[PDB]
């Protein structure tokens, strides 16, 4: 119960550490776990630089994004909520600047999969517009259920979701699943990016999109174990 | 007194690290710090090598730009100096030739706001022209009370300047606040480059540039404590 | 006989290691040798993150990819199998996602040489495209003796193989040489992506590329030597 | 006597492990230095990977590029001695393919000058291309006295040039400034072709060329004692 509970901690810090250490994650960044054993509930760091959480710094959220804990929480905690319940097949969820995504955060350039390893995006990334159902005057961030829901409705059912002028959301079923997604979305992004001005893309069909989506496999722990290793190798535990 | 006037010292250091290893500051770059015991007297490293700098380093200015101290001094002094003078609530000036930014001091290409996270640029960074008063024989330096003092007024009352074909200014009514914020001035500027050669880039509006420009609160500590952290990491003190 | 074995694996080892501190392989690639004591045979290591590889985890293969190991193998196996044995003068086979060159692995610009260090590339790199012959519903990637036939169809006698949407495949007479090629082609790609957005390229001639396509002598070695020494420099080994 | 020998010699290993941290140089590069005992003579690292050259390295050269020395040199050590006889003044010659600069080498767009920083240039870099006298059928070289001879030609009294197809040659009166230019020249061409790509460029005029050029004093220093920290702090000696 505690043991296990500890090491769905333990995995959210090592996510962190990672996503930091592969230049993913900025001092502005979160990842959640849905509770394995209670899906009304999630676990969240508390408001933290991410190079200092630790184990005893995630708190407990219900899936209205309030916790018991007296310690201080993320704002846009909502964002990790409302996606909760809306996706019952989501088991993570990651919110980040990722700096080669980022401009597709602002361009009408479409983010779509260019190579195998982005085939999990799906056609493109869709983009949340705050602008759509409450004008020009926000401040573009995610801190309350009601905008949080219109996030969620622009995910829908898919991987990825970018917050116009914000940032990326990445979801998945497990926290390795996530922190995988966001590593190679940062690399697909990075490469179209090159390619639009090298010359012609020809991008993945709908049909490699499919068959390709579908590949991701052992490859996710083969990533976390790099990545872990590459931790130790850096001293950063 | 001499308590607390150490503790300026101490975070002008820190700062000073802190931009150097988040690839902000070069070898040509400084930050000081007005007296918060006495406004007409500001803090400044002498002139020496940004990674060489310790609290034994730093000098102390009149708003005329000059010391008693008998040790050689930035000869860009008067940029902080005349800023000083002129804007009572700036605390903290920085000037570096931060790469990203860079470009945006030689080109027409306006650095306007893409991200929240560059919401206190305000509508776009002014850029100072020395030629427009000194013609095109100069230096293109800000080594004269003169000179500089149209820096201070290019710089009017926004957050950023650009001195034209040299660098760029960042001021604060913190050490802490102006670390951020020229953190955050890289990273929108890499942004909107990459924005610009991938598509077309929807701007923030003047409205969320207002209201997201507010939201910069708890955040400021969070950053310099990360990148506090980080330089333990690094072992770089 | 099994002395000279284990310094064959050591040296796919410090490839790995070299490879993946510079920047070249990721967390999805791998690197084969040809056994020097028996053509019919290569090596490579079983399925792991590259950064996890030890002597003890390289496998032996026959040209049709099939090994009496018991642990688990590359699945892309097969693109080394099928390249030894339509090039008997090929000795290794490298398979990454190389950042700068993935670019080039899906738009219509073809990577030609444009310094001297790239002249081994030869006219341009020779692109594969599974879906001449099948289709686009495939999943991209090279796990089939059919499919990998014909990619190494594609790379034909040349040095270099571009699998669209996918990788790139490199191709020399010893581990070292490979390397090496691995290294400046990613070097060569980032100058010409560079390149063709500061202006007009001028691309090498057909004589350079064959004259100084030839000057890759002594400098394979002196490559070896740095990025091994860079790798003590890292405490990687 | 022997003393100061040492001292140019620890000099020039210093400025290689620079160049080698700071990113200017590669494998394949190397920089000399006029004997300041005989103009005659200049020294030069004997054929090694730059990250293993000792003091115990280094070999004595006279102006036809000739050593007694028994162990092998660099095949281009003719581009230092025929710079050092065609130009009394110059006392250091660098030769790298550093990165950022390597695309001016193959394109149209001249490299000039577009911050201060950059204003050692003078008007843009010369471009020596060998097919004016030798045809498109070379390898690219500097292995020859009268290809060297051209190489000089083409730089006449400027601080540097660009081999076509091949790297660049900085120039100066010390090892230190020498190293200076080097690393402002990467940077100066980094943002110019940034710039390029984010709108268009106003470059540096004549006067400020002239102007700007002449205070890059005290600023030599300053930048050789940062960087020579900087190697402390990564414990490269
Ligand atoms: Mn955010
Ligand atoms: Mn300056
Ligand atoms: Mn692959
Ligand atoms: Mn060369």
Same mark, same amino acid.
């Given at each position: 119960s505690f043991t296990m509970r500890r090491k769905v901690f333990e995995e959210l810090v090592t996510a962190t550490k990672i996503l930091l250490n592969e230049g993913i994650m900025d001092t502005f960044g979160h990842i959640s776990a849905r509770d394995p054993e209670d899906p009304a509930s999630f676990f969240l760091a508390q408001k !933290? =630089?991410?190079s200092l959480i630790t184990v *005893?710094?995630?708190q407990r959220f219900n899936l209205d994004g309030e916790t $018991? *804990?007296?310690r201080p $929480? +993320? !704002? @846009?905690?909502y964002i990790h909520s409302e996606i909760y319940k809306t996706r019952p097949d989501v088991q993570c969820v990651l919110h980040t600047h990722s700096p080669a995504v980022l401009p597709?955060?602002?361009v009408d350039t479409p983010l779509r999969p260019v190579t195998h390893m982005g085939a999990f995006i799906g056609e493109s990334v869709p983009v949340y517009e705050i602008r759509d159902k409450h004008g020009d005057e926000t401040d573009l961030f995610g801190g309350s259920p009601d905008v949080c829901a219109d996030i969620a @409705? $622009?995910? /829908? $059912?898919?991987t990825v979701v970018l917050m116009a002028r914000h940032g990326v959301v990445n979801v998945g079923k497990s926290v390795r699943e996530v922190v995988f997604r =966001?590593? +190679? !979305?940062?690399q697909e992004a990075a490469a179209l990016? =090159? /390619?639009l001005k090298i010359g012609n893309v020809k991008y993945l069909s709908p049909g490699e999109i499919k068959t390709a989506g579908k590949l991701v496999g052992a490859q996710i722990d083969r990533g976390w174990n790099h990545w872990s290793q590459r931790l130790r190798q850096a001293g950063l535990a």
């Open positions: !933290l =630089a991410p *005893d710094d995630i $018991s *804990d007296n $929480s +993320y !704002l @846009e905690r597709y955060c602002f @409705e $622009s995910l /829908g $059912s898919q =966001a590593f +190679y !979305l940062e990016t =090159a /390619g």
